[PDB]
Design a protein around this ligand. Structure first.
Ligand SMILES: [Mg+2]
Ligand SMILES: [Mg+2]
Lengths: 155, 163
């Protein structure tokens, strides 16, 4: 069968690279994943990220802080890539999010075979369904909200 | 009061950067844009890009070869970023193509206000309509302008449907 995952990332981007700060992913079965990268340089954060992203992060002793390799491994387990379920990825205005996600494996040719090479655009579905009314920058909170919006849109 | 632009990019992406090779854009009113960047390093190309993308590029002397700044300016004009129509960007999937297009303006904060921050995905629209049988993929698919043209043709079939 098919399982949908809704995700969001926070990152530092400068028109050239995208340095991942955090990633939240929620499956439609209710499972949740959240991690913060130990490998981004907070000194490179612009004012917006420094004031709206970085203060919401966990304290530094939290086990939520993980290396990029750990996050990759954690996502391979979370997405159940070794099993037979098919995977759909969804994000809201997530072009950069998709890149940040794929770059945890490398070039998009390094993606595990069962992870799709594109992320469905939740904003597109929303508009396609006539922009139904939905409810009123932490990545797991945002990912959770995307799932909630999908279920409303598709109800 | 809205105009749809269908686009494709070709690039060298290595898990860190996305270095633009070319971009093709087709407006649903028939207008076309195509340019090839003078700034990507062809030696950095992988074997797949070397065989499928590079040989379809135009000769060095072609006026199609342009700087990144020039492509930006050209796109500001072509998309009519200061016009009254709203702009819709469409591509087969967006993601890497959307980042490659938008990095023409540098960081996300510098994208002109009227350019949308997402690209509508034809692949998603095609699936949402029940995966209708489509025409075959054309002769030179990894020529960015050929790709964009074909995307518009598909969009029209997917939406000029009986539903
Ligand atoms: Mg986001
Ligand atoms: Mg492309």
């Amino acid at each position: 069968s098919m399982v949908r995952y809704f995700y969001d990332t926070e990152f530092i981007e400068d028109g050239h690279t995208i340095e991942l700060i955090s990633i939240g992913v929620v499956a439609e079965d209710g499972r949740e994943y959240y991690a913060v990268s130990t490998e981004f340089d907070p000194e490179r954060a612009g004012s917006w990220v420094r004031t709206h992203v970085l203060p919401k992060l966990p304290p530094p002793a939290s086990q939520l802080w993980r290396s990029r390799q750990q996050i990759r491994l954690d996502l391979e387990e979370f997405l159940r890539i070794d099993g037979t379920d098919s995977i759909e990825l969804w994000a809201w205005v997530g072009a950069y999010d998709h890149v940040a996600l794929c770059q945890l494996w490398g070039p998009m040719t390094a993606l595990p075979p069962t992870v799709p090479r594109f992320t469905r655009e939740l904003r597109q579905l929303w508009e396609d369904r006539g922009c139904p009314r939905m409810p009123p920058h932490d990545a797991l909170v945002d990912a959770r909200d995307q799932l909630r919006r999908f279920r409303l849109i598709t109800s």
